[PDB]
Amino acid sequence: TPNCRVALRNDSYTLHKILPNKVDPLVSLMMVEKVPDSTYEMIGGLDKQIKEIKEVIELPVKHPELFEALGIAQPKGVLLYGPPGTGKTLLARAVAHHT
Amino acid sequence: EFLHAQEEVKRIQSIPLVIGQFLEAVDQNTAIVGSTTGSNYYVRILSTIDRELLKPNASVALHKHSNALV
Amino acid sequence: YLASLIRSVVALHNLINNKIANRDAEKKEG
Amino acid sequence: MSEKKQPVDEDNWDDDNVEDDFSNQLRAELEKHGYKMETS
Amino acid sequence: PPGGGEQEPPPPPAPQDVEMKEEAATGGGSTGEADGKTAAAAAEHSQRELDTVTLEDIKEHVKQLEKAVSGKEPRFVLRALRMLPSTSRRLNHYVLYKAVQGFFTSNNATRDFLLPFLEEPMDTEADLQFRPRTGKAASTPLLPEVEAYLQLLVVIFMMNSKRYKEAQKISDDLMQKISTQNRRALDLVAAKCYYYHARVYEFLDKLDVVRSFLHARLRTATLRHDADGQATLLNLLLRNYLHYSLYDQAEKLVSKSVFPEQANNNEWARYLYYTGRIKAIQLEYSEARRTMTNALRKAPQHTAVGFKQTVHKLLIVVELLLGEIPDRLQFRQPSLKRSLMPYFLLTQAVRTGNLAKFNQVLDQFGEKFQADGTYTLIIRLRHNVIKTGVRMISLSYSRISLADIAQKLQLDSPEDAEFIVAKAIRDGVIEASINHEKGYVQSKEMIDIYSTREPQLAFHQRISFCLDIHNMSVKAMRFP
Amino acid sequence: PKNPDLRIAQLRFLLSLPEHRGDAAVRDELMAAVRDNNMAPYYEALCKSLDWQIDVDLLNKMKKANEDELKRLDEELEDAEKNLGESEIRDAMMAKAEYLCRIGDKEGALTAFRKTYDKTVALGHRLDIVFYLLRIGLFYMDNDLITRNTEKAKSLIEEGGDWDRRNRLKVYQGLYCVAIRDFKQAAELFLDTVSTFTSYELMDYKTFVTYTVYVSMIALERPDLREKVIKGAEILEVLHSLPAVRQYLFSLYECRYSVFFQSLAVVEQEMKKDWLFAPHYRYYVREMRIHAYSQLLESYRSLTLGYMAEAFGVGVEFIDQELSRFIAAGRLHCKIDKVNEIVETNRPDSKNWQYQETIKKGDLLLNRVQKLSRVINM
Amino acid sequence: DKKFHGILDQGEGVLIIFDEPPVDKTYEAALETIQNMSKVVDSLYNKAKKLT
């Protein structure tokens, strides 16, 4: 594969053996930042915002055909707002986790 | 006879000895270390070391010229 | 008496470790 | 297989030991105590 | 004819389906690989013959209208079975008699027609030198005649069929029995027909001139072959010698035939039981219980095992005679539970100290014990009841009057209440003294049994035993 | 639902086993059997009942309503997959299979619970499914299936704290270790009685107090009863409403030995008619008698046997035959004399009795491995 | 209450006092191994008895 380690002899620099799988750089990126991995089961009292955020994100992945039946462009961007400490990060982390 | 050859193998554990650090192992009895000269190596091991004293991030001895696990 | 009791169980676990390598190769290899 | 040449033809153990002791001895030993007070 | 012609026509061919695959594969193998090259110590045809006894035990039940087995006999008996080019027509003859059942009607063998079904080893160049065929070509009709046993003017048809097999049995005993396993594979055919040779005779006939013939059968056994001829000819020697009073028990002590050293895991298992009762019936208690236990844990995994309903009863008869008792209903079954309740109520009386509690059992279930044939050992438990009780009382009470123990054991007499205690000390149950002038029996309190040698004797039996099973785990491991 | 479901299993015990008491129990269960859509668990109970000859329309009005809830599941499973949530077919009947767990037997439950086990990525629904599998495995006494999911329960609690799923769980082994005759575990699983909540199965907290005190007087000696259940304000005030059990516990503690047997006769009678102690009620008192005997007997050495009649329990010969069978049982370390009318004690060391239990287990494990090595390798 | 250990006499009130830490470490800490090893032979059924 491209971007994969190998072993290598040193007298002639002949390829020796595949050395496994090191890391994706995207995997290391989130490993640095350490977002608090969440789920719907730790959401306290936001039932209507969960129904809003599914319509824009959850539906145009599992059912992309369902907008062609209505013939509109599928949405792309979501703005979340409110005072801090009310669950903006965990709700966005939940939706990406469950689909 | 096996106990006589058991102790004979440690003549490679002589005095000009350099220091690496354990990183991982591909399989049984072959590992991957990183020397303190910056370059990493894919090395063979020596059989008599208890394998279950390895990898938190272990300090290891390496051979001078051949640069294998010691 | 405890230490000899352990000696019988350990080699019995070794006995199944040869019955795992006897029956599971005669159909595979032949 | 299963030949057997025929020449002729917890939940269980602790209570069996308890069945052995009071097998015929004071099963409903409840009301003799009401009668042992005036006697003894 | 509609109730016939839809329920009767599938019983011929679907047994013909499975009988072209089980004994035709045995006839295809055990003529060419028992008379042929070899069937070694690791053979398959014996276990294949073990597969063709058990399946036909519960296969046939009906009197065979529509010739579904009554037409198998005019099929399976017109067999030369000499070599492959003369049996290539016989491989058609496995199918040529199928339309004889179907297009026409055969001869329905209903209790009369077995006489023209036995005289065939002359017909079309049949032989008896190929007794891996003919001993099986005896047993392929000799089993289903006697499997149902049907006991209504049939016995002579079973007899003359055995007589032709007895003619094969004399050619077995005399003529070329070496390295073809002519004795070995027919020692089973000897052994398996003996149980059909017996339940005829245990039903209506005698028993004892076969025994001298069995001595003549034991004569040539271990005299040409020392494998499965020493084994099955001695349980079948014992099987009514125990039930008879003939000498036959101190003979089997000094007999060399005790060890055949291998007897195929199921006849060896009961072998230690028939001689396990011999030591039980002639008062050898402590030696018997280890060959009773060893006769239990070598038996296979069947459920309707009515002889195992007897060994679990008998194994702790002799342990009531020795004092030890396990939980007998530890593997209690829907078929074991009814076979334990009179006998489990017996050992309820043994763990107690009451005396005529034994009498309250032996009148309630005195008839049941004679059905199982065990009463003569039951009658002597009163020696073991009273030694259980005198150990029970002496350990509880320290200084008890001898004129109190008799009233608790309902002995009705203090004047021999001294005397059991005399035989309790003569046997060695309790140690301490009796003030015969006063009347109390004092007992000394026990002392430091921990600092005595005797718990090492609880160890040394088991130190050496546990090193053996570690050695047996080594000796049985490295077969690869 | 499975929340009122344990009282059914008590009333099935209340139906069959008291043989004369089988009239009001077959009425008030049928008051709940042929309502709330129960179909399966009472056919053989009806066989243990009377005829009840016309139950056919009584079944047909209910198996229809069983199908009605089952067909609206059959009308849900295509509208949930068209515009999907988090697999809302399964997610609907992950709450409606517990209905089908109550209504049908375990098979509709077990194929739907192991379905929806792989749905939820968080244990907060998974570990609540496991509590359902534990509870039906008590009804059908699935003693081999509870051993699987209890470890599968406990393997979930370590991530997170889950104390409403741990302290809830401790009651289940606490009822299971008292279902089996394992009392030193049952008092240890009932150690808290603080976080133990007003649950569904012991709907009175005070009935839970009776169960945790009846096992506590067996498992532990008296350096610990004199600190834990005499000084706990959480345990004193809840039996402060109980006249009997307060007296039943304290009579052993206050050394009021004569009135100890009086209330013990009440409890042992009550323990017979109670469910889940009736397998072992005759095991209880014979351990509580020998616990009561040795406490008095290990204070003195030269006690006469007729002192125990008027101060411990009446009947001199009743004391005589009862102590005679317990020294002969190999316990209760003393040695009764007869014709000078005195009971002498001894003190044996903690070697031989500690040696005696070792030779039991050494025979038993050697019984296990000798029998094993014969079965394997032919 | 085991805060003190001894014996009391009833005839004349004689308190025979004795003491020994008997042994606890040697046997019961070797006894629990046996029931650990019993569960190992039980777990041998899940890779041998089911398997071969």
Ligand SMILES: Nc1ncnc2c1ncn2[C@@H]1O[C@H](COP(=O)(O)OP(=O)(O)O)[C@@H](O)[C@H]1O
């Ligand atoms: N509605 C909520 N339910 C549960 N936890 C919440 C909620 N809102 C905030 N939290 C807590 O807040 C933390 C997440 O911070 P968050 O509120 O997402 O920051 P932001 O201000 O970006 O929304 C989590 O640790 C979580 O425990």
